[PDB]
Amino acid sequence: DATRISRSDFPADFIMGTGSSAYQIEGGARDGGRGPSIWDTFTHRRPDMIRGGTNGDVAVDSYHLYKEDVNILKNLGLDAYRFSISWSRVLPGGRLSGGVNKEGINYYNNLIDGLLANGIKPFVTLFHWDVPQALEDEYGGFLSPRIVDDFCEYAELCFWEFGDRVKHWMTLNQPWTFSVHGYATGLYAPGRGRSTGNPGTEPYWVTHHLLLAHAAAVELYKNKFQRGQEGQIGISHATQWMEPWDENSASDVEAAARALDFMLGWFMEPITSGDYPKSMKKFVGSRLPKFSPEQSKMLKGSYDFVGLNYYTASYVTNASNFSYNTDIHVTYETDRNGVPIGPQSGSDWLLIYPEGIRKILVYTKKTYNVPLIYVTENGVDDVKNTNLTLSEARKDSMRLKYLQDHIFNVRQAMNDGVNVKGYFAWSLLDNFEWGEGYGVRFGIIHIDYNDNFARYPKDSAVWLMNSFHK
Amino acid sequence: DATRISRSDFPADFIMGTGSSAYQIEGGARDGGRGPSIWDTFTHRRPDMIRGGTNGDVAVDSYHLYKEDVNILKNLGLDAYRFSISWSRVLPGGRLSGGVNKEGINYYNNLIDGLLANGIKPFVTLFHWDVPQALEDEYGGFLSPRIVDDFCEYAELCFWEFGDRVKHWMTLNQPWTFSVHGYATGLYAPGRGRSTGNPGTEPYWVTHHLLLAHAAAVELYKNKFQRGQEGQIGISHATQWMEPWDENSASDVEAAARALDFMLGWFMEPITSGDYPKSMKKFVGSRLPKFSPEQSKMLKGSYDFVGLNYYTASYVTNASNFSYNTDIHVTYETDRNGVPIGPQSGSDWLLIYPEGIRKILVYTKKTYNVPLIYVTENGVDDVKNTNLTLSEARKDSMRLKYLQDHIFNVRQAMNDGVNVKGYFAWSLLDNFEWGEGYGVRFGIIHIDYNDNFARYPKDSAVWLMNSFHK
Amino acid sequence: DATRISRSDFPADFIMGTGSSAYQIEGGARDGGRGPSIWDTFTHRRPDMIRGGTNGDVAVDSYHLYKEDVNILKNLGLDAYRFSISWSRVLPGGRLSGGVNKEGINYYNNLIDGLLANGIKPFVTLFHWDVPQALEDEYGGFLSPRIVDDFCEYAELCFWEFGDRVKHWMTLNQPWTFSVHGYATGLYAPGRGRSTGNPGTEPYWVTHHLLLAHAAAVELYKNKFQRGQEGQIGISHATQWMEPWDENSASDVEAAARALDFMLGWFMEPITSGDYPKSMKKFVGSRLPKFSPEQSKMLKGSYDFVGLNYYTASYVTNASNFSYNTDIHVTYETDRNGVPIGPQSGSDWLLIYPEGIRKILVYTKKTYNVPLIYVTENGVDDVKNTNLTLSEARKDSMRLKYLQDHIFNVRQAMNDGVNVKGYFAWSLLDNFEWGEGYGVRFGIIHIDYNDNFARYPKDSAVWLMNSFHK
Ligand SMILES: C=C[C@H]1[C@H](O[C@@H]2O[C@H](CO)[C@@H](O)[C@H](O)[C@H]2O)OC=C(C(=O)OC)[C@H]1CC=O
Ligand SMILES: C=C[C@H]1[C@H](O[C@@H]2O[C@H](CO)[C@@H](O)[C@H](O)[C@H]2O)OC=C(C(=O)OC)[C@H]1CC=O
Ligand SMILES: C=C[C@H]1[C@H](O[C@@H]2O[C@H](CO)[C@@H](O)[C@H](O)[C@H]2O)OC=C(C(=O)OC)[C@H]1CC=O
Ligand SMILES: [Cl-]
């Protein structure tokens, strides 16, 4: 049973942790010499696109309050903390000739030594959507294949400055979301595809360039750093469990496999076999870029581990100019007869379905044969409500149950044979939630926006410490 | 023509300034030894009563940023600035035995010296609704008449500490509003009037205690300080022009004059002749307290100048257990025959009626025969809109026009023989707006809540500087 | 005689001074939150275009050493100092929504109070080529007419922050050089015209937009600031004396008038009469933009004074796809029979011809009828020589004679009837000289690049103090 799950149900080397990303927590957007990212410009030029018209200029101020975040982490007692570096903080002009920012480097070094002083292992992500405005403006950012070399320079700086203490790297986090909402729906930065954007072509190019940036950085680590620093490198993917609306309709079963193909296979097959998935070549056809054979050779097996981010699940059925959305030829169902696949969380797109994580995990292992997996993101948001006082606000039973059920399911997946090495809840703190602004709370630590972002643990944090301390 | 109005249309001694109140701008609610006010407890225990569930903990942080505000005021170039002292900042327990807070005193001395170093005269208000919670919890704040002595100790403290530099004092600002929304409607702190409250009685006791508090303090200043410090003391009243729905119906001319009595007369009659107005005694009867004759003797003439606050206007006509609102026996109407008395501003209760200020001014001199008047508040809010970028947000055309029109009308009232010595715009900064939270913007200085409350002047400020500098 | 010229040869109100521009002296390119200008990017991306491949990242560090520069200015004893603000220092994203940089504002306030503490009048230039990279990248900077509104926002900030102490403003300095070398020759930033650039069209558009930016800012000052702040506003133009190769050839005489038309008339006629000069309409024809009539009304008489920058002179004769260079249809001669118009300075393009300044001054007064003139730039560079020790290096007799002869000629122009109100030597310090890097020294104060930019006065500085002190 789930409510009894605890650290002793897992192997000794298993790792528990929490996470954040730079733009959602740091603030200090124009402090310590940081240059602007595309999220800075998007939130400031297109405030109508953000709930409340807000931005992450200050966010929850971890730039200044990191000593406090570290204390929280020490009190929480878990093994590891996942965070990302802001590219334009260390390189404000995105490329080397734009200047190297010592002060931004000093910030991450302080954060990292702080965590190590306290027995907390840092897991570091190079990239979480925050493309330096300078590169976006000079050559369209990830639209251009120039992005691959600049990203490499960026990565080499990080390995050089931090790699003596950081032993666990990830190139990208959730590239799917960046591609799709950046270039297909236009809801996220840079906000294209609603020249001006083409949901039919751009997403495929962006993704193509993401994968090459990732493979080049991995080759760079492996050939120039791994032997001296002895770390490991990988990548983190968005996933959603895709379930056949009708378990009988072989048509529905294939729609579900195709949906997986277009979300996770899009990224996973290239680093497994060096190529896009069959179904995408078929349905996308000539709008889908091709890898030179030496590229395929670089991509193939370009990782030491893979992380999966899981939130929700869905029923899939077949569908009946172009765009990524329509190329998939599926339709999404939440109800199987006015019977929802699971209950709503605070967000109407997030339906709670614990077994989804067990299935995605088993599927990933079987389909792609990954030797080593971490769950790098998993969590839920509180029902919105500005009426509660802190004693009420902090009682987050839904999240508490959500975490138990999902962690229990991760344990199942390991019995099923999947080599899962760790699990990170998302997120540490309530923070900036992109298009949703500050209205949506994902943190195990509450934040009081009315009082300098005072931090206070929620019952889930207390529970994680008690059940998983070490 | 209003758009041409400028300093040279006024006598040389005429004073121009802006204003704030402590709880709306300061923040530092628990910093530097401040104790809690009733507004602190209200917003924190009843967040459902505030748009957004927000409070004044940080507000716009003038507590830490007061140097910038002073620099803004120097650039603005007007003669004077009107602010209030937070009672529970200088005396955290409200009464002397609660402790005298040196840091609180030091803050105001720093503020006052900065203003004077820059040639800006301070006009200081002892009280603006922020009753120390300790006095509220010990004896019901302004319900009890103990409040009069405590208020007196508070006042003496301020005169002794600051009276060498501050030469213009006001005991209270907007007491009407405190009484009515505090104890009749129960929308503002302490939030009483559905013991749990009683809109039939408490409002009248509260007003009774407010006036005795004001009179005690004026006797104190006048007997013990005035000769040595040579300052002046006064008080500041809420006003709203009241127009007879039908200029003819001599019964409407009556509903109007009765609406005046119940708003402005309720406070001005006592300091004029020592008693409440007839209309009020008749309709309220025995629920309305009496003044001992020594009290009447103390109240009568208790001021060196009066300040009027004016925002809007209304049509009044006659009406059809007990409650202040029903005791008035009037109904308010916004239009004659589908025509609004004036256009809306960002706020639906605020209709723009420049002529009301001329009228209110003339009425006041005529009915109560005040020899010296200041307009202590007058301003309007922006239309809410989180979609605008700063260069759009700062074009505050409506405010600019509103200021010009009201200032023009004040100038007319002077031609009519009313002796006005100055006018203060409300308010200097966008800030906390009580039940409205941060959603409503009254500042001539824009405030960016996403980025540490960055301040930036609106066109109204630039126009004030250019048209009234000296 | 020239060598005897001194302050007593001039009227009492006459003003003497020195000058610099932001990018040439400040450094601190990425300090205190400054954003990049087009000169940052040009020098860093195209180092081959700068002698030595250097840039102004540190320059002569006046950002950090300004207290020392102020001491020098105090020792030098002249009335005034001319400097420019770095647009992207106060607005790092060029437009308001890119963030207002308090720290950059604080720097100029410190500089300005420093100068005022010492009896030195500040003359301030809004713009000296340093276009914020953000605006160049978003919409092509001065190619787009969007530049006019952003430039206005920028100007309003400056007037608001500094206008209480700065009483003498200039919108642009040397716009000619910016247009021509930015867009016709491509030698300076942004380096176009060698899409990709069109020397035939772009220079004319850039210039057109410069003039509108200037006229809008002047309208802004005059309508919204001048009455409260009581300052004055103007602009500074490049000039070169143009002399008929053959004093007889009426053909040569017209070539000279046409050359003046294309250098100085290009800017001067629009603010005099509201239109470009006749000769340019003729030779440029339909490639020359046109002013709407309300634009002409804005431009006409848009200045309180004009400053002229004079360095050298030339002989002009007639010439025999498109480009600004060829549109002029003149040829430049330095020799009148192997007899050079004047001797070389350290730069082969700079030929010393003192009477040139007297003629340009008289010509400007007669042709355009300007009531009030300042010479805002005038000076010469030392022969390059890295072999001299400081005692030798500082003996700058050529500059000393250059200054005497030119100042003498300014005095002549005033006898000739021109109302000249002041004269500023260029420059205060040796500094970054654009395409020439650090190899070229224009300062009256020597700089030691080998030793933290130690400052040391040259004989010319000593002479100016002695002869013009006050
Ligand atoms: C909405 C954003 C992403 C989400 O991106 C994550 O959202 C979190 C909450 O806003 C963020 O805190 C986090 O940065 C991001 O990984 O990742 C998962 C999604 C999903 O549908 O499940 C598969 C997407 C939501 C779908 O509409
Ligand atoms: C709503 C608050 C007060 C208002 O009180 C002022 O409100 C400002 C805006 O919220 C405040 O910033 C300020 O503290 C206060 O003086 O003063 C005038 C009112 C009126 O009806 O016209 C006479 C009241 C509004 C009536 O419903
Ligand atoms: C070379 C740059 C400009 C020069 O620009 C000035 O050059 C100085 C020396 O490099 C600079 O310090 C200064 O910024 C600038 O005003 O202004 C005058 C020129 C001229 O030919 O005389 C009319 C130009 C030189 C001609 O080739
Ligand atoms: Cl580079």
Ligand SMILES: [Cl-]
């Ligand atoms: Cl006491």
Ligand SMILES: [Cl-]
């Ligand atoms: Cl803007």
